[PDB]
């Protein structure tokens, strides 16, 4: 299993504009288009993103192309972030996948706000970090996905996804 397959499991794949768990306009493999309530603003962002007039609809290829850009952007963001880089560098390959996932979902800034959990991960106190990560809006809002990520940080293995 790898970061791409992990994310593909958590976000799904949709070829028509849809609304995400938070109500925002999204397409493909979790690519947020706008936090704006306008379907029109969405279609506009969408066309700007692909470089053609889509009509609210894209092909598998286009969805993957976006997915590649987003994973790349997520990793670079971590590496440029002063709060995130040190945790990332400190982790094994599997756990690294778990932080990339959080960043993909919630952005650099948000994850960066998990101060106490970031500290425990760095210290490698797995069990404690798992309990603290669960005390968030994130966990309460998307509990199944959050438990998977959390289990990944807790164990260092792909068990939560080998089911799926």
Curated annotation (Swiss-Prot):
GO molecular function: lysozyme activity
Outcome, altering residue 30 to F: Almost complete loss of enzymatic activity. The enzyme is destabilized by 1.5 kcal/mol
Location relative to the cell: Host cytoplasm
Alphabetic keyword roster: Antimicrobial, Bacteriolytic enzyme, Cytolysis, Glycosidase, Host cell lysis by virus, Host cytoplasm, Hydrolase, Viral release from host cell
Consequence recorded when altering residue 117 to F: 10-fold decrease in enzymatic activity
InterPro entries: Endolysin_T4_type, Glyco_hydro_24, Lysozyme-like_dom_sf, Lysozyme_dom_sf, Phage_lysozyme-like, T4-type_lysozyme
Outcome reported for the amino acid change (mutating residue 132 to I): 5-fold decrease in enzymatic activity
Outcome (variant: residue 11 to N): Loss of 84% of enzymatic activity
Entry's Gene Ontology BP terms: cell wall macromolecule catabolic process; defense response to bacterium; peptidoglycan catabolic process; viral release from host cell by cytolysis
Primary localization: host cell
Phenotype for residue 132 to M/F: 2-fold decrease in enzymatic activity
Catalytic residues, chain numbering: 11 (proton donor/acceptor), 20 (proton donor/acceptor)
Gene Ontology CC, one term: host cell cytoplasm
Binding site for substrate: 32, 104, 117, 132
Consequence of substituting residue 11 to A/F/H/M/N: Complete loss of enzymatic activity
Effect of residue 20 to A/N/S/T: Complete loss of enzymatic activity
EC numbers: 3.2.1.17
Entry's induction text: Expressed late in the viral replication.
Effect of residue 20 to E/Q: Loss of 99% of enzymatic activity
Activity's dependence on pH: Optimum pH is 7.3.
Record's catalysed reaction(s): Hydrolysis of (1->4)-beta-linkages between N-acetylmuramic acid and N-acetyl-D-glucosamine residues in a peptidoglycan and between N-acetyl-D-glucosamine residues in chitodextrins
Effect listed in the UniProt record for changing residue 26 to H: Facilitates transglycosylation more effectively than hydrolysis; covalently bound substrate
Family: Belongs to the glycosyl hydrolase 24 family.
Function according to Swiss-Prot or TrEMBL: Endolysin with lysozyme activity that degrades host peptidoglycans and participates with the holin and spanin proteins in the sequential events which lead to the programmed host cell lysis releasing the mature viral particles. Once the holin has permeabilized the host cell membrane, the endolysin can reach the periplasm and break down the peptidoglycan layer.
Record-given protein name: Endolysin
Organism of provenance: Enterobacteria phage T4
High-level lineage: Viruses, Duplodnaviria, Heunggongvirae, Uroviricota, Caudoviricetes
Encoding gene (name): E
